[PDB]
Design an enzyme around this catalytic site. Structure first.
Site: not given
Ligand SMILES: CC(C)(C)OC(=O)N[C@H](C(=O)NO)c1ccc(-c2cc(F)c(F)c(F)c2)cc1
Ligand SMILES: [Mg+2]
Ligand SMILES: [Mg+2]
Ligand SMILES: [Mg+2]
Ligand SMILES: [Zn+2]
Length: 888
Positions: A264-265, A267, A300-301, A304, A323
């Site tokens: 997905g991505a 960080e 989410h990113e 992080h 995570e």
């Protein structure tokens, strides 16, 4: 090679500074690197060994003195070894020039080309594909990075830190220099070059009032799909400030979308890089799911930056510490942003299907494994999603105030340093001591959540003494032995509970979290006026198999009157499962005994009545409603059946849906019609900043009901389907395609929706998914059409995953007894493994349950896996994965 967690030892070397010079050309990229290095206190005179995979050496040197191959170093395309006699005993400089070629890097790790964008992906050990390094996260260095490229093709140049110079270069090129003084591990390095367009904004932090520049980038064609991402970033920053008291520490944050991405991505510090499907959206060109997806992934990113970037990992075995914790932080965020109960429900729904399956498979591992071979296979739903539930339990145990205290202790104590799961538990323990008001208290037992694999089972017995007004809940826990522990120890299980008065639906006690710390315990409550119905594991308070031992009558009452969304939803789930298991066995016996006639147990009529009651309640939640009319996921059901015959399960589901539809289809239709006005309201269709999660849940409910009605061949439903195909919302007109599968107009809507989808890269992928999951008897023929006309030889993981993964969830067809579905997916895995081992391993997901099916299908799946394992050119990734999955 097998890496073991017990074998952690610090390096005998230190890398203090990295100076990069990345020179991008058409047929090659030149990477010059100067490492300013030192000898560590752990050094014992060993050789200097660098990681370096697939690098072409032009030259290497120590202290500007050219090293010569064979005499002073060897390189075997994996490790560069510099013999110790040639390694200096104090501060020295290692330098090198290598050639790599992103153009042909289809594995999408290291430096690669995605369409016309040059992009890196370095987690976990991808930096070694770019230049030599001691590629491990405890090697913290400063980075000074210069990128040069053809200016017309690559006008936008990005790396970590501050851009401190821009300059012209003879021959139509430029360069840009980025200096990032804070120490970081190499997996957080990133570089991007391309003809990128952007949206931007300025964010002003809450406490220090620092101005942060926010940039979101994409290729020019999709620049109009950037707005929601930018809003989600602002939302993320505010939440970290408001909930955790945490501000962003840098001047600028870039989000960049690329078309080819393994996940997905990522960080990367100040430079988060995204799968385009997790950053880009517009209401005209995206389905509803994209909006929660982008919120989740951007959040989410962003989270992080603290949990992973400022507090980093000592070693990769600690992965769940960044995570599990960041997923937990993103879940808090999304629940707060969406304000719908379905946000939490959807997470639990995913955990208990996909993660529970993994944890009872041969792949079962704790959230902190003891070993790995492939880091690219380490990023599992166990580490992420059970990881998140283990991180969430701290909050349940501590409550919000003490949780925030513990979390801040963790951040203040480890900021700017590496950490381990122990460091986090320590911080939480300090809060636990404060909460229970004695320094005697500890969370030592809690650590078993990190080390013990498998899903605990929690079961209940009840007693009520009417005269004594005394109620008892007897609780038992057990985890099945597996390959990781022969003897499973009792865990610290927090059980959030309520007691419902069955007479008036009222709460009978205050908020209570039972702390189960033994194999079993009896919890007693006094002054309980009447016999209650227990509301157990509110919010799904521990990642366990709940065995509530309630009657369906009790569950129906909970479903109608309980205050907790999860317990209501679980009570419904449990009613469904009892029905499923019963009908499954009835169908199985009829098949095995080849009966000419037999009986099926009908669906509970009071249960059907409860569904109607909730569906007709104007104040009840549309998202919740869509869950109660849907049977539990197949992958949840399979956890409860040995030697699952998928055909018998398909017949069981069919019977149960038909039973309920025969009573409620008119209610379904009525609701499908009455929900239209609010569900499809176009007021804000051209405002990309306006996202209404309730409205989207209404569309979910409509599309779920339409699906039920279409399968049922409800009178004249095809009219609704045709009108639905004219809707401006892709969720609706893509739905019209899949539900039309049961009519002769399927291929008419196929072409219609294809034309609507074909000029937006991401929409076309959604279209592919919709075709892939279509309930068609000619689905194999349809897949071949997709391959020849649309997919072709695309190496885009989004294209390949879109075409095949939804199909693998077709219970009836994927599991065709000929094994042809198994054959098909294995052909795709092997083909994909030639250029992208990571994604090939992702495409193995269907096989994870192989030893849970009927003995014929087990054999069929095992045959295909053994065939894959026998491929001479099998990747490390795939081989290791399939070896573990087939217990070899
Ligand atoms: C869906 C969420 C947001 C939970 O996860 C991701 O989108 N990406 C993972 C993550 O934790 N992002 O912060 C993620 C990121 C990188 C990798 C990753 C990528 C590679 F190309 C690798 F080779 C690898 F080993 C790991 C795996 C998962
Ligand atoms: Mg604010
Ligand atoms: Mg009202
Ligand atoms: Mg493409
Ligand atoms: Zn992450």
């Amino acid at each position: 090679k097998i890496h073991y967690r017990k074998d952690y030892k610090p390096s005998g070397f230190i890398i203090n500074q990295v100076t990069l010079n990345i020179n991008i050309h058409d047929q090659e990229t030149i990477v010059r690197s100067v490492l300013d290095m030192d000898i560590s206190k752990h050094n014992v005179g060993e050789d200097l060994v660098f990681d370096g995979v697939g690098l072409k050496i032009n030259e290497i040197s120590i202290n500007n003195k050219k090293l010569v191959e064979g005499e002073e170093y060897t390189y075997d395309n994996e490790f560069l070894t510099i013999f110790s006699k040639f390694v200096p005993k104090s501060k020295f400089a290692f330098s090198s020039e290598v050639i790599i070629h992103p153009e042909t890097n289809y594995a999408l790790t290291g430096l690669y080309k995605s369409k016309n964008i040059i992009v890196s992906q370095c987690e976990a050990t991808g930096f070694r594909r770019i230049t030599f390094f001691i590629d491990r996260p405890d090697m913290m260095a400063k980075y000074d990075v210069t990128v040069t490229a053809d200016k017309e093709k690559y006008p936008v140049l990005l790396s970590n830190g501050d851009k401190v110079n821009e300059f012209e270069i003879p021959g139509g090129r430029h360069g840009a220099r980025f200096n990032d003084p804070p120490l970081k591990p190499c997996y957080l390095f990133a570089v991007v070059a391309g003809d990128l367009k952007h949206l931007s904004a300025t964010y002003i932090t809450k406490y220090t009032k620092k101005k942060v520049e926010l940039y979101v980038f994409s290729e020019e064609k999709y620049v109009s799909k950037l707005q929601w991402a930018l809003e989600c970033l602002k939302k993320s920053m505010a939440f970290d400030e408001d909930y955790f008291g945490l501000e962003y520490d840098l001047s600028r944050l870039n989000l960049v979308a690329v078309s080819d991405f393994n996940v997905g991505a990522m960080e990367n510090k100040g430079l988060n890089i995204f799968n385009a499907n997790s950053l880009l959206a517009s209401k005209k060109n995206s389905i509803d799911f994209s909006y929660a997806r982008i919120l989740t992934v951007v959040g989410h990113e962003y989270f992080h930056q603290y949990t992973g970037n400022r507090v980093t990992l000592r070693d990769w075995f600690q992965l769940t510490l960044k995570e599990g914790l960041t997923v937990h932080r993103e879940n808090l965020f999304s629940e707060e942003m969406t304000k719908t109960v379905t946000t939490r429900l959807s997470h639990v729904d995913l955990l208990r299907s996909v993660q529970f399956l993994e944890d009872s498979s041969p792949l079962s591992h704790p959230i902190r494994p003891e070993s790995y071979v492939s880091m690219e296979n380490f990023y599992t739903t166990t580490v992420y999603d059970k990881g998140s539930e283990v991180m969430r339990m701290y909050l349940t145990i501590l409550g919000e105030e003490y949780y925030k205290k513990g979390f801040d202790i963790y951040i203040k104590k480890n900021d700017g340093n590496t950490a381990t799961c122990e460091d986090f538990n320590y911080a939480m323990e300090q809060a636990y001591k404060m909460k229970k008001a004695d320094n005697s208290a500890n969370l030592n037992q809690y650590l078993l959540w990190f080390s013990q694999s498998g899903t605990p089972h929690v079961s209940f017995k009840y007693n009520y003494d009417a005269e004594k007004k005394q109620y008892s809940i007897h609780v038992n826990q057990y985890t099945k032995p597996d390959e990781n522990q022969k003897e499973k120890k009792p865990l610290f299980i927090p059980i959030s509970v309520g007691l419902i008065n069955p007479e008036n639906g009222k709460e009978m006690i205050s908020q209570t979290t039972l702390e189960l710390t033994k194999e079993s315990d009896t919890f007693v409550f006094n002054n309980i006026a009447v016999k209650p119905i227990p509301s157990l594991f509110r919010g799904f308070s521990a990642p366990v198999y709940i065995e509530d031992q309630l009657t369906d009558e009790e569950r129906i009452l909970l479903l109608k009157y309980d205050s907790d969304a999860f317990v209501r939803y679980n009570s419904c789930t449990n009613i469904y499962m009892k029905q499923i298991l019963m009908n499954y066995n009835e169908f199985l016996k009829a098949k095995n005994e080849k009966l000419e006639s037999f009986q099926l147990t009908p669906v509970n009529a009071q249960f059907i009545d409860a569904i109607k009651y909730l569906l007709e309640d104007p104040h009840a939640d549309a998202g919740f409603k869509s869950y109660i009319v849907s049977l539990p996921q197949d992958r949840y059901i399979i956890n409860f059946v040995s030697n699952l015959d998928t055909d018998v399960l398909a017949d069981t589901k069919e019977y149960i849906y038909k039973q309920i539809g025969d009573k409620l289809n008119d209610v379904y239709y009525k609701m499908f019609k009455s929900l239209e006005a609010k569900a499809d309201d176009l007021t804000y269709f051209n405002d990309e900043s306006h996202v209404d999660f309730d409205q989207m849940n209404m569309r979910t409910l409509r599309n779920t009901l339409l699906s039920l009605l279409s399968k049922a061949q409800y009178p004249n439903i095809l009219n609704e389907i045709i009108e639905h195909s004219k809707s401006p919302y892709p969720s609706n007109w893509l739905t019209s395609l899949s539900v039309s599968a049961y009519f002769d107009k399927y291929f008419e809507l196929y072409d219609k929706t294809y034309k609507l989808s074909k000029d937006d890269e991401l929409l076309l992928q959604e279209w592919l998914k919709t075709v892939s999951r279509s309930d068609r008897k000619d689905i194999y023929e349809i897949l071949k059409k997709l391959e020849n006309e649309v997919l072709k030889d695309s190496k885009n993981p989004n294209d390949i995953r879109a075409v095949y993964l939804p199909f693998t969830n077709n219970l009836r067809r994927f599991h065709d007894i000929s094994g042809k579905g198994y054959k098909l997916i294995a052909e795709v895995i092997t083909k994909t493994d030639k250029f992208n081992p990571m994604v090939a391993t992702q495409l193995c997901e269907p096989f994870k349950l192989w030893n849970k099916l009927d003995t014929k299908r087990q054999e069929l799946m095992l045959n295909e896996m053994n065939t894959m394992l026998q491929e001479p050119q099998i990747s490390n990734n795939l081989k290791e994965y399939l070896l573990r999955l087939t217990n070899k």
